[PDB]
Amino acid sequence: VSTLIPPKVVSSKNIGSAPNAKRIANVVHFYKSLPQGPAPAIKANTRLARYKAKYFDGDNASGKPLWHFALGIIAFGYSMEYYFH
Amino acid sequence: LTTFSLYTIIVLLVITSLYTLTNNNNKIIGSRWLISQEAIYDTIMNMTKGQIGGKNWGLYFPMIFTLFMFIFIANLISMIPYSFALSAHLVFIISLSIVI
């Protein structure tokens, strides 16, 4: 009798399935990426990247670096008032 | 030297910091300060996609962006109680307008 049946030859399931494209993508995309990723810039070494570390971090939305940076410009024209007068 | 020349330098130094000490780590999440420069990008993207809305909307988007940022920064310079705007030299602004 008939021993002809679906199971003996299978090769349509092993390409036809949709997650294969995603699978082979993410073995290439992921295998070496960091499991988190590192923190917003904090030191580039110039002796002012340390200034960034305390105030002007990406996680800081606090008004402190703004105040500090603003205050520098106040010091410039105020002295120059006394340099011109 | 020249006060005007000095203030052109200050503007350049402010603008670099917005994509260096604001763009911290080049995060795919985006730094809290850098969320502002995403929003500026998008609201002018959607504005000149509105206004001109061609395929040349984005082709004239850098010019429309540096005219934004220039005025945006130079009215921070104007808030400083002893530093005087580049825009307050009217001859630069009016000249720029006629040129465009």
Curated annotation (Swiss-Prot), chain A:
Keywords: ATP synthesis, CF(0), Hydrogen ion transport, Ion transport, Membrane, Mitochondrion, Mitochondrion inner membrane, Transit peptide, Transport. It is found in: Mitochondrion; Mitochondrion inner membrane. GO terms for biological process: proton motive force-driven ATP synthesis; proton transmembrane transport. GO terms for cellular component: mitochondrial inner membrane; mitochondrion; proton-transporting ATP synthase complex. The keyword Ion transport applies. Signal peptide: none annotated. Mitochondrial membrane ATP synthase (F(1)F(0) ATP synthase or Complex V) produces ATP from ADP in the presence of a proton gradient across the membrane which is generated by electron transport complexes of the respiratory chain. F-type ATPases consist of two structural domains, F(1) - containing the extramembraneous catalytic core and F(0) - containing the membrane proton channel, linked together by a central stalk and a peripheral stalk. During catalysis, ATP synthesis in the catalytic domain of F(1) is coupled via a rotary mechanism of the central stalk subunits to proton translocation. F-type ATPases have 2 components, CF(1) - the catalytic core - and CF(0) - the membrane proton channel. In yeast, the dimeric form of ATP synthase consists of 17 polypeptides: alpha, beta, gamma, delta, epsilon, 4 (B), 5 (OSCP), 6 (A), 8, 9 (C), d, E (Tim11), f, g, h, i/j and k. Belongs to the ATPase F chain family. Present with 14600 molecules/cell in log phase SD medium. This is ATP synthase subunit f, mitochondrial. The lineage of its organism: Eukaryota, Fungi, Dikarya, Ascomycota, Saccharomycotina.
From Swiss-Prot, chain B:
One of its GO terms (molecular function) is proton transmembrane transporter activity. It comes from the Eukaryota. One of its GO terms (cellular component) is mitochondrial inner membrane. GO terms for biological process: proton motive force-driven ATP synthesis. It is found in: Mitochondrion inner membrane. Keywords: ATP synthesis, CF(0), Hydrogen ion transport, Ion transport, Membrane, Mitochondrion, Mitochondrion inner membrane, Transmembrane, Transmembrane helix, Transport. The chain crosses the membrane at residues 1-21, 57-77. Its main location: mitochondrion. Mitochondrial membrane ATP synthase (F(1)F(0) ATP synthase or Complex V) produces ATP from ADP in the presence of a proton gradient across the membrane which is generated by electron transport complexes of the respiratory chain. F-type ATPases consist of two structural domains, F(1) - containing the extramembraneous catalytic core and F(0) - containing the membrane proton channel, linked together by a central stalk and a peripheral stalk. During catalysis, ATP synthesis in the catalytic domain of F(1) is coupled via a rotary mechanism of the central stalk subunits to proton translocation. Belongs to the ATPase A chain family. F-type ATPases have 2 components, CF(1) - the catalytic core - and CF(0) - the membrane proton channel. In yeast, the dimeric form of ATP synthase consists of 17 polypeptides: alpha, beta, gamma, delta, epsilon, 4 (B), 5 (OSCP), 6 (A), 8, 9 (C), d, E (Tim11), f, g, h, i/j and k. This is ATP synthase subunit a. It comes from Saccharomyces cerevisiae (strain ATCC 204508 / S288c) (Baker's yeast). The gene is ATP6. The chain holds residues 36 to 135 of 259 of the full protein.
